[PDB]
Amino acid sequence: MASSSGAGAAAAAAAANLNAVRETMDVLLEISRILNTGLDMETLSICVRLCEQGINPEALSSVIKELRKATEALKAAENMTS
Amino acid sequence: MIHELLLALSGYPGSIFTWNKRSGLQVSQDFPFLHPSETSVLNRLCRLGTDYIRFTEFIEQYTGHVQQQDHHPSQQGQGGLHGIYLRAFCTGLDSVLQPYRQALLDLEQEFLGDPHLSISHVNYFLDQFQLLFPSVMVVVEQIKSQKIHGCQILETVYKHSCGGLPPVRSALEKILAVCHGVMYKQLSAWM
Amino acid sequence: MATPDQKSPNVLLQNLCCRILGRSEADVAQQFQYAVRVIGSNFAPTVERDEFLVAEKIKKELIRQRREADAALFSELHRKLHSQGVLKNKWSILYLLLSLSEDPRRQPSKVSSYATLFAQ
Amino acid sequence: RLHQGELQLLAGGVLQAPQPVLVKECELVKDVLNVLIGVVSATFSLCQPAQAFVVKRGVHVSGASPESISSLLSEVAEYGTCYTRLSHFSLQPVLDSLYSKGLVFQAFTSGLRRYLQYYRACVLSTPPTLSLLTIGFLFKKLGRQLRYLAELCGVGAVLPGTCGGGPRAAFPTGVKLLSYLYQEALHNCSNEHYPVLLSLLKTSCEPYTRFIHDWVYSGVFRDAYGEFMIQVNHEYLSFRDKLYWTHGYVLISKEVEDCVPVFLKHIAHDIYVCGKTINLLKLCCPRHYLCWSDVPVPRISVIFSLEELKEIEKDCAVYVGRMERVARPQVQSAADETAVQLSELLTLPVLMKRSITAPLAAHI
Amino acid sequence: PDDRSWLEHHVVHQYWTARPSQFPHSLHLHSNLAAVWDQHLYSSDPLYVPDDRVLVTETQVIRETLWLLSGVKKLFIFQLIDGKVTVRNNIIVTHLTHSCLRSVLEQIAAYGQVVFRLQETEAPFRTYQAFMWALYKYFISFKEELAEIEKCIINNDTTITLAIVVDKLAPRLSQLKVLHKVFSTGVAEVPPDTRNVVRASHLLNTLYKAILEYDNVGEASEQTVSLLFSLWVETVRPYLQTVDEWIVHGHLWDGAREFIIQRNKNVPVNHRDFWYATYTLYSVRQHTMVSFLKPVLKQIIMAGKSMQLLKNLQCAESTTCQAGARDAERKSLYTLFLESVQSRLRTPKENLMKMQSIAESHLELDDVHDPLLAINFARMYLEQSDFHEKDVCVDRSSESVTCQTFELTLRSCLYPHIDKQYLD
Numbered sequence A: 001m002a003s004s005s006g007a008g009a010a011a012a013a014a015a016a017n018l019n020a021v022r023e024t025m026d027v028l029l030e031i032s033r034i035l036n037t038g039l040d041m042e043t044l045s046i047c048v049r050l051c052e053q054g055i056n057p058e059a060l061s062s063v064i065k066e067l068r069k070a071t072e073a074l075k076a077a078e079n080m081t082s
Numbered sequence B: 001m002i003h004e005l006l007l008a009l010s011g012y013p014g015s016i017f018t019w020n021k022r023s024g025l026q027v028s029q030d031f032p033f034l035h036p037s038e039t040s041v042l043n044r045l046c047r048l049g050t051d052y053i054r055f056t057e058f059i060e061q062y063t064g065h066v067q068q069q070d071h072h073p074s075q076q077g078q079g080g081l082h083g084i085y086l087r088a089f090c091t092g093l094d095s096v097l098q099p100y101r102q103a104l105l106d107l108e109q110e111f112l113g114d115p116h117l118s119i120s121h122v123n124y125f126l127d128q129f130q131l132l133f134p135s136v137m138v139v140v141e142q143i144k145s146q147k148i149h150g151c152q153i154l155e156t157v158y159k160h161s162c163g164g165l166p167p168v169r170s171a172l173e174k175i176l177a178v179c180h181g182v183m184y185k186q187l188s189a190w191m
Numbered sequence C: 001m002a003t004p005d006q007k008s009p010n011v012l013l014q015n016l017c018c019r020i021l022g023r024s025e026a027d028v029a030q031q032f033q034y035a036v037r038v039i040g041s042n043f044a045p046t047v048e049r050d051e052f053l054v055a056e057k058i059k060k061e062l063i064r065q066r067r068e069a070d071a072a073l074f075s076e077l078h079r080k081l082h083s084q085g086v087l088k089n090k091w092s093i094l095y096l097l098l099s100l101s102e103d104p105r106r107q108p109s110k111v112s113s114y115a116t117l118f119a120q
Numbered sequence D: 001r002l003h004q005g006e007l008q009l010l011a012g013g014v015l016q017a018p019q020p021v022l023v024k025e026c027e028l029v030k031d032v033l034n035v036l037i038g039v040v041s042a043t044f045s046l047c048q049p050a051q052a053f054v055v056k057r058g059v060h061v062s063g064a065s066p067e068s069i070s071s072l073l074s075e076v077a078e079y080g081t082c083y084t085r086l087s088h089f090s091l092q093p094v095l096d097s098l099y100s101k102g103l104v105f106q107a108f109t110s111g112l113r114r115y116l117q118y119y120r121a122c123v124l125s126t127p128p129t130l131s132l133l134t135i136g137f138l139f140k141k142l143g144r145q146l147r148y149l150a151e152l153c154g155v156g157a158v159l160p161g162t163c164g165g166g167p168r169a170a171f172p173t174g175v176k177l178l179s180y181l182y183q184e185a186l187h188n189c190s191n192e193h194y195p196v197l198l199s200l201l202k203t204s205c206e207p208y209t210r211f212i213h214d215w216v217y218s219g220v221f222r223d224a225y226g227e228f229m230i231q232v233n234h235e236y237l238s239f240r241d242k243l244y245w246t247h248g249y250v251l252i253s254k255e256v257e258d259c260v261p262v263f264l265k266h267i268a269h270d271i272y273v274c275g276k277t278i279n280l281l282k283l284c285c286p287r288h289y290l291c292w293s294d295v296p297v298p299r300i301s302v303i304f305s306l307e308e309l310k311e312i313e314k315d316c317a318v319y320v321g322r323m324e325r326v327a328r329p330q331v332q333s334a335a336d337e338t339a340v341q342l343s344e345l346l347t348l349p350v351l352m353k354r355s356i357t358a359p360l361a362a363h364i
Numbered sequence E: 001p002d003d004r005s006w007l008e009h010h011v012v013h014q015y016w017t018a019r020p021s022q023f024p025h026s027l028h029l030h031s032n033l034a035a036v037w038d039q040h041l042y043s044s045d046p047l048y049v050p051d052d053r054v055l056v057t058e059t060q061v062i063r064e065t066l067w068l069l070s071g072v073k074k075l076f077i078f079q080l081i082d083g084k085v086t087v088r089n090n091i092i093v094t095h096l097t098h099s100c101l102r103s104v105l106e107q108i109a110a111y112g113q114v115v116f117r118l119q120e121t122e123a124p125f126r127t128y129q130a131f132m133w134a135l136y137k138y139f140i141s142f143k144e145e146l147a148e149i150e151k152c153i154i155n156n157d158t159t160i161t162l163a164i165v166v167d168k169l170a171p172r173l174s175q176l177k178v179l180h181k182v183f184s185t186g187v188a189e190v191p192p193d194t195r196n197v198v199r200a201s202h203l204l205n206t207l208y209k210a211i212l213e214y215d216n217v218g219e220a221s222e223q224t225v226s227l228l229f230s231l232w233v234e235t236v237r238p239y240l241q242t243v244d245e246w247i248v249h250g251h252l253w254d255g256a257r258e259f260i261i262q263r264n265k266n267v268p269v270n271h272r273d274f275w276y277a278t279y280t281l282y283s284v285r286q287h288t289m290v291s292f293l294k295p296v297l298k299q300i301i302m303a304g305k306s307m308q309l310l311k312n313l314q315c316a317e318s319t320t321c322q323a324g325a326r327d328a329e330r331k332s333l334y335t336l337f338l339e340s341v342q343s344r345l346r347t348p349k350e351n352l353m354k355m356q357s358i359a360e361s362h363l364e365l366d367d368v369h370d371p372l373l374a375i376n377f378a379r380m381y382l383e384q385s386d387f388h389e390k391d392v393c394v395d396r397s398s399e400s401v402t403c404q405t406f407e408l409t410l411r412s413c414l415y416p417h418i419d420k421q422y423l424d
Helices: A003-034 A041-052 A057-081 B002-009 B036-063 B073-079 B084-113 B119-125 B127-146 B151-161 B166-190 C009-021 C025-040 C051-064 C068-084 C090-100 C113-119 D002-010 D025-036 D066-090 D102-125 D132-152 D174-187 D194-218 D242-248 D262-284 D306-327 D338-345 D348-363 E002-010 E033-044 E058-069 E098-119 E126-155 E162-188 E196-249 E294-312 E333-345 E350-362 E371-385 E406-413 E415-423
Strands: B017-020 B024-027 D021-023 D044-047 D052-055 D059-061 D230-232 D249-251 E054-056 E078-081 E084-087 E091-093 E261-263 E279-281
Touching: A003 A041, A003 B017, A003 C068, A003 C090, A003 D002, A003 D044, A003 D052, A041 C009, A041 C090, A041 D002, A057 C009, A057 C025, A057 C090, A057 C113, B002 B017, B002 B036, B002 B084, B002 B119, B002 D066, B017 B036, B024 B036, B036 B084, B036 B119, B036 B127, B036 E058, B084 B119, B084 B127, B084 B151, B084 B166, B084 D132, B119 B127, B119 E126, B127 B151, B127 B166, B127 E126, B151 B166, C009 C025, C051 C068, C051 C090, C068 C090, D021 D025, D025 D044, D025 D066, D025 D132, D044 D066, D052 D066, D059 D066, D066 D102, D066 D132, D102 D132, D102 D174, D102 D194, D102 E350, D102 E371, D132 D194, D132 E371, D174 D194, D174 D262, D174 D348, D194 D262, D194 D338, D194 D348, D194 E371, D230 D262, D242 D249, D242 D262, D249 D262, D262 D348, D306 D338, D306 D348, D338 D348, D338 E371, E054 E058, E058 E098, E058 E126, E058 E162, E078 E098, E084 E098, E091 E098, E098 E162, E126 E162, E126 E196, E162 E196, E196 E294, E196 E333, E196 E406, E196 E415, E261 E294, E279 E294, E294 E415, E333 E406, E333 E415, E350 E371, E406 E415
Parallel strands: D021 D059, E054 E091
Antiparallel strands: B017 B024, D044 D052, D230 D249, E078 E084, E261 E279
């Protein structure tokens, strides 16, 4: 009868770790906003996952700048075609 | 989300509206699917929800525990909020939240009736409680901070009874009436 | 325990490109190739690999931008992030954030439409 | 779903978030009703050692986040756990020969069974058309009161093995039960539990008041569990000297607080002397006209209605007069309101004093 | 993200996000007026560099306008800079010229800035609390209409244009302009270092003068006159309460010392100056006289002195403490005034039985109901379930011709009752 109680506590601990991770991610998003990084929730999450994978910040910055220029050209074309 | 928002207001924090023991209920982050003005409205509603959550937390903190029959009831009053007046205060707070709970249930029914309703309708409907709750929360926080004990808390409630909010005045009158009922019970026993 | 299918950095980069451009993966193939070329290029080591040094540099840069309040907020957020310990590579994330910071005071140099000529 | 995906992307696969299982509310209500009866459901599983429902991980409800819905359901599961565990604690049924808690405890458990029956009636009265939030709020006060009473009685829902709370003291019996009820009534005098606690105290005292009645009128010690302050030593009851009076019936004097009900302490000594005197008179001169009168002895019982109390006092006076010549409501209805009028007018200790000592003083 | 993106495309475009939402619009000259104007500008001036303009939907602009008017801060189009609502420069609509849209939005933004200044009110004192309460009631009334407009927008069944919305809000916009001017004069014009008594007196005098102005304005100000009357009634409620407390209990309970009369604590009732010095008017500046009470202020002072004497004279227990009409059962000066104003203007065991029936329907026949338990369970479940226990219309619009002058209405509804109590 005892065993059933343990799974609830383990699930609660995992949920607490996940909530702490969520709080940390929100803090990171706030920091990015203060830094005027221009990342959205999806973009910020992608950036966080990529950074966790070890990407060189100089290469990442150059790639981001080039991608931003291409995205701006594509957005201008999309706004001109609408 | 409206049901989720009410659940957060009902004490079920979620991923958007996180409850923090220190910060209370808060919007977790800026989401890409909302206009920043909608984020501001959400933050105001989360402020109201945070105040409600803090009230519920206080109610649990001073009413939620069974009274330990520690032989000396007088010492319970020092560290922990204690006393029959403290129980009456918690009961009054719960009674004042009862109309708020009823209004929340009515909001839930309306949202079930119309899935197209927006947060502005809730902000309209809940504004009366958005004005009521902050003042009662301030009064309760003052009572807690000053460690008002026994019937001396009643004097503070009277001081708080002089508030300008008519609904807050009526609520404090109800709470004071309950506390005076307890006081009168003790006085009856003595007399 | 099947660690969520964290798609390989190429797939993650493709998804990021699609998100940034607001186009489907099929529409960003040239951009994906450009990204692969950039990622395969040797990048110099970051100037600072110390979390606290990076936070101090960020604060100094914000002060240089006359954002002293933002510098204090950055230092506080950095302290909180370091204490949380959720991120494994704090120095790398700090370097990325520093590289992505934008000065609100410098009027955006509107990218001449001519830059699109090299995009093709 | 988007936000949870974003959180998983940020968490880099490490937070294996339980898959949100979307369930229809018209089902969640059924699970809630089962919890109100302590029944495990598809989303809530009963942890047998805790007698507690455990929420299935990844429960998703339409229109709410699965985490917030899980939180609400966790609170509801805690309420259901309290209900089921309290029922199990009160479910100790039969005063079998192994029952060591005594008749006062058995009567208390009978009152608790009545209370749980009323709770079950309320749960069955709950219409299945109510909202989950509406139901939660409606039963919130009742669940809080149940949890408070379970902790007060030491029958708290927490599994005895997992709660590192120190050894739960045995539920008090006899005089210990009366003192416990008086202390809890004082501590809970402001709670919604105060009238129920008064009813339960009356019901648990009923066997003890019967024992007191038999001791006072016939000198019969009916304490099967040693809860009464008086012990009968049959060895000295056969003596025909001072030793018969001193040792045949002995009031347990050393732990008077533990052997005499706290509310009867002011009359416990007089009751003991009266019962000893009655037993002595029965032993030495059973045919004495004072000792041999077939006059019915007035009933000693706790009364909580002011009208019932005045009627009992008048009947007691008439009974006393008739017996001297021969020698020569509380909590029992529903709509009735006078039954508690004294309980609202008078404090539980003063009410108990007036109700118990008047017949006691008359008989003494 | 694909399912989410499909919803995001179908749940209203991310244009509110800094990501440029391109939306399809009709290229008809009447429908593409923005694009045609851009083309003409491009054709006309070889020096014209095209600024980056954000295309916003007219419905989207309307919604953001309503949210601004609903008092939302941090709008995307209308930015609040130094407490001034400012329109983002890079916004354009398909059907408006940038300059025309900018002008209309500037008018709306000016009204929003007024609201924003009014929206920031904290209520630290009784008079300020009353002003806040009245403001909240006004904002509630405005938010009701705003919510109805938003609902109609959400239904999307009918073409709602910015002009239609502006016209719908025109009466409310006029009321808002009048309220803004009155509030600025009554509060914003009050120097911050003024004593709370002085601030209150200035506000009260401003209210009286505004009341006179709107009463002289006639029928066209009826909504404004009603608003001002409600504001006056609310602001006098605390003052009338303080007056009532002084008259009834003989004790001036004034925590903020906002009343024109201050009690000198140094003068005991047995002091020779008790009749003269115990209650002092805050007369240091002649400006401390309450204009609405000024016609009756002298009688009020005499009555207060008399009541303070009677309560301060050790009167034998005078039987004229009749157990009859309690001062708590006495209509308050705010309550008596409101009742008299409405009347002159013709203006605007059972639970135990329920528990027994519930038990009979849900309890088994043989289980005796425990009345203490029955009551407890009734309160916790049935009385918990059945807790569906969920105004002086001073609108002159009805009988404005028959409505007395604000001063005449005051003299006839409030002053006579006060004089009667004073005489008694």
